[PDB]
Design a protein around this ligand. Structure first.
Ligand SMILES: O=P(O)(O)C(O)(Cc1cccnc1)P(=O)(O)O
Ligand SMILES: O=P(O)(O)C(O)(Cc1cccnc1)P(=O)(O)O
Ligand SMILES: [Mg+2]
Ligand SMILES: [Mg+2]
Ligand SMILES: [Mg+2]
Ligand SMILES: [Mg+2]
Ligand SMILES: [Mg+2]
Ligand SMILES: [Mg+2]
Lengths: 343, 343
């Protein structure tokens, strides 16, 4: 597996990242306490995932750049840009867990729930964002793709924040209106809140680093990747309720939080007016017994089977898109990633 | 007054800013609801101040660039970069009001306290940040100072977040330890949390736009501006307690929030062991009667007089720094700004 090959060198580079970020303290000991906090935030929130987004930069880089140009220094930059993608995710997740009133992430208590942290986590999240641009300046400032990467990270952040806005507006607390929950609304939410930053960003970053800056090549890569991103968020929604928290590392809140989940959208398409009534009375509430009623209804409608069928249809569709849109990039770049999220 | 001269053209440009930012909706009606929210966030949080930071970019621009190069297009860019500085401030203030548990800002309820908003304001604050970089790309991408401005805004954000970290770490809730509150700690907090972004940033932005990118010229401008920034935060701390909320537009929380305020630092330098005991028992608590006891102690020690004396000594010191470090920039750039914050 090409991801497993690269993983150990990638994960080890995190020590170099922590080191260069905390060497700001060298020439300014007055900010020592702040740098110690930054280190703690990095170690708690950036470590412990599967690193699929960051590894995707490294894997794609190795398949897009001639082996003769994969010197030690170029590899260091690739690992760094990979870690920047992981830091962007950590920024979004720390804030997301506050806004979604979540309990655990990656098997441990959410950062904001940690005693002594609380809403100070807002500033911690913004520091994670700032670290991205410090790392890009330190490692990539002299490279011809520097400005392209800065603009890519900024644009991806904007798109993701627009998506979070749609997510939050469609799920007002204490206000259950099921008519908002359409398939058309759902697809817009997930394209912006997840697809750009999770799938387009890491491959696009590798493309720029390899000198592939063509409008056309980026457009074709988007066609494949935004569809993969849609599937990924559908899977995330399914696992919120039907996944095992010991595997997922997080407790689900979509029902309690009144979210426009793929599950509720599918339920609404299949529900009798009597099932619709059950949904309306129990959705968007914290009571455990009410959450249980919605899950029972989902099982009654065999939504787990609908998801399995969607996974298969989606895989076939993404493979057809790869056949059409991959060239001139090697199909392996997209196939490797697909194997990672569908398997 | 050179600020009042420029104000009306600057404030009117806000309509053009809102317009170009919400024309993202044109070719993507799927995100319409999000763009409507962005407009609301802009109008509530970016409007209603004195615009001293943003106007400083415009004023400095007019004094640093030859009148022959102040065409309509260059002025538009100056107003835009000014508004970017105001957006950076709005980003920091929306988050700051959450973390400081504040009630009002600019005479109205804090955005996060508004019914229906709550912790969704976290994402709203990040959208304000993102708007900065959209505006820089749209107006300045073809200019030779583009990358310098991007790096300046990113660096200023990092510095400000490091300062916020020091502010929050020195003021842990429910944990009153007065020994942390030293003059040396105070000066470090305010340099990072306020001085860079409030004073260095707007003048530095104008300097880059005028082609003044010299390490030496920026170093000299910092010497003056970081000192002005220190005074500004001292004044802000004084006004938290002794200002009139109808003028300041905000209710003070520094005592309740256990903050390392200039007032508490000065109090500690002058207090008998018996006054120290009063401070220790009443500081960092929400009870109105306990806040009143600290204010009475501050008045007992004549801290309002100490502040008046500090204001005069500081003004003299900043003027001496202008005499030494202004050249080759026109002294008027620094004098105009000084008149604005000391008067
Ligand atoms: O990991 P989570 O909280 O299930 C999630 O996928 C996290 C997330 C945050 C920001 C953008 N996209 C996804 P969400 O959308 O809140 O369900
Ligand atoms: O306007 P405020 O809340 O008095 C303040 O000046 C706002 C602020 C926010 C961020 C950086 N610097 C100042 P603070 O430091 O919280 O006293
Ligand atoms: Mg979430
Ligand atoms: Mg969420
Ligand atoms: Mg989820
Ligand atoms: Mg405050
Ligand atoms: Mg504050
Ligand atoms: Mg204050």
């Amino acid at each position: 597996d090409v991801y497993a090959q690269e993983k150990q060198d990638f994960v080890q580079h995190f020590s170099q990242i922590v080191r260069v970020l905390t060497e700001d303290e060298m020439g300014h000991p007055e900010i020592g306490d702040a740098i110690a906090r930054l280190k703690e935030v990095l170690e708690y929130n950036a470590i412990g995932g599967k690193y699929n987004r960051g590894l995707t930069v490294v894997v794609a880089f190795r398949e897009l750049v001639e082996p003769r140009k994969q010197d030690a220094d170029s590899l260091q930059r690739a690992w760094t840009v990979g870690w920047c993608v992981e830091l962007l995710q950590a920024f979004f997740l720390v804030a997301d867990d506050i806004m979604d009133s979540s309990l655990t992430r990656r098997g441990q208590i959410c950062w904001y729930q940690k005693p002594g942290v609380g809403l100070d986590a807002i500033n911690d999240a913004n520091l994670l964002e700032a670290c991205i641009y410090r790392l890009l300046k330190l490692y990539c400032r002299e490279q011809p793709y520097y400005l392209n990467l800065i603009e890519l990270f900024l644009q991806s952040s904007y798109q993701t924040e627009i998506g979070q806005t749609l997510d939050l507006l469609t799920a007002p607390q204490g206000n259950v209106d099921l008519v908002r929950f359409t398939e058309k609304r759902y697809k817009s939410i997930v394209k912006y809140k997840t697809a750009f930053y999770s799938f387009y960003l890491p491959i696009a970053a590798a493309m720029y680093m390899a000198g592939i800056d063509g409008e056309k090549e980026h457009a074709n890569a988007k066609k494949i990747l935004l569809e993969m991103g849609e599937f990924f968020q559908i899977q995330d929604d399914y696992l919120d309720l039907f996944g095992d928290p010991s595997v997922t590392g997080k407790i689900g809140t979509d029902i309690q939080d009144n979210k426009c989940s793929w599950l509720v959208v599918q339920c609404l398409q299949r529900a009798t007016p009597e099932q619709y009534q059950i949904l309306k009375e129990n959705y968007g509430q914290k009571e455990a017994e009410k959450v249980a009623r919605v899950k029972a209804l989902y099982e009654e409608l065999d939504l787990p089977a609908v998801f399995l069928q969607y996974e298969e249809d989606s895989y076939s569709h993404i493979m057809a898109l790869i056949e059409q849109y991959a060239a001139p990039l090697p199909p392996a770049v997209f196939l490797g990633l697909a194997r990672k999220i569908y398997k």
